[PDB]
């Protein structure tokens, strides 16, 4: 469904194709169908440009998201990383910034996954 940026979901029903995009979820998948009076049990390719227009206008009329939000992907944290932010802090440090630990259960940012030399003499349990 090439209608915006690298969006080409296809070869199935449309209901699926909906959420089947980096930005669409639930309140955006079938919820949009309603606002456009379309049944979920439809084909994607079949929808000629005619149907595509409804999406090209109504659907494409989204806020800063997916294909356009590519201008705030980091900005969403640009104002809470450097600065003396905890997240820095966890920002200045680019570590998880939302109530949790750092030793473990946050290995997303701090340390990728590469096996660290495990502690030897200091209870590992």
């Amino acid at each position: 469904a090439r209608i915006a940026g690298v969006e080409i979901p296809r070869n199935k029903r449309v209901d699926v194709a909906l959420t089947y995009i980096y930005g669409i979820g639930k309140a955006r998948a079938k919820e949009a169908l309603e606002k456009t009076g379309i049944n979920p049990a439809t084909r994607v390719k079949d929808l000629t440009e005619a149907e595509v227009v409804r999406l090209r206008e109504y659907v494409e009329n989204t806020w800063k998201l997916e294909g356009e939000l590519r201008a705030e992907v980091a900005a969403n944290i640009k104002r809470l990383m450097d600065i003396g932010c905890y997240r820095g802090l966890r920002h200045r440090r680019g570590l998880p910034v939302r109530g949790q630990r750092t030793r473990t259960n946050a290995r997303t940012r701090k340390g990728p996954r590469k096996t660290v030399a495990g502690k030897k003499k200091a209870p590992r349990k």
Partner: protein, 178 residues
């Protein structure tokens, strides 16, 4: 004619409307164009790049020859007739109607695209700015496609003085850093 005319009688008199010049051909013309790209033979030791060669002619047909840089490396790569380049001469009148797919398309996409070039310019009518890795075209599958451009565009215009280098290149088309 079309743009050529909105270039022969539109963005041609304006210059004299601002401040003339000793000639009715004094105004800058379509000096040089070309395109420039070719990020060196990446995919394969020169044998799969062909699937990135013809990809240069991914808008029209005019069999580019890739050229070569200068053989002296023997570090990175480079030999007696390697690629590393581009160029190709394809100006003309349709080249005007080619701005139709230039001074138009692209802008409607290219990431956070808002304006075109922040001053910079000067010296010549060849302001070096352009492309990333986006075509903005669907006139073929674009699924079977799988390359990665990069580089920019040059196109000179016989506009030495800044107030020519980037003067006409303002009321020139419309898509630009406003």
């Amino acid at each position: 004619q079309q743009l050529k005319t909105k270039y022969n009688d539109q963005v041609r008199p304006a210059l004299m409307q601002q401040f003339g010049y000793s000639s009715v051909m004094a105004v800058p013309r379509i000096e040089k164009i070309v395109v420039n790209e070719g990020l060196g033979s990446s995919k394969e030791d020169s044998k799969a790049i062909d699937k990135a060669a013809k990809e240069l002619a991914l808008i029209t047909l005019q069999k580019p020859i890739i050229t070569k840089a200068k053989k002296s490396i023997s570090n990175f790569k480079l030999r007696q007739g390697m690629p590393v380049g581009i160029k190709v001469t394809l100006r003309g009148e349709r080249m005007y109607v080619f701005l139709e797919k230039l001074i138009n398309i692209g802008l409607p996409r290219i990431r956070d695209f808002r304006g075109i070039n922040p001053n910079a310019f000067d010296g010549r009518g060849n302001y070096n700015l352009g492309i990333k890795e986006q075509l903005i075209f669907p006139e073929i599958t674009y699924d079977m496609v799988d390359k990665t451009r990069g580089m920019d565009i040059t196109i000179v215009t016989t506009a030495k003085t800044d107030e020519e280098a980037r003067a006409l290149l303002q009321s020139m088309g419309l898509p630009f850093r406003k």
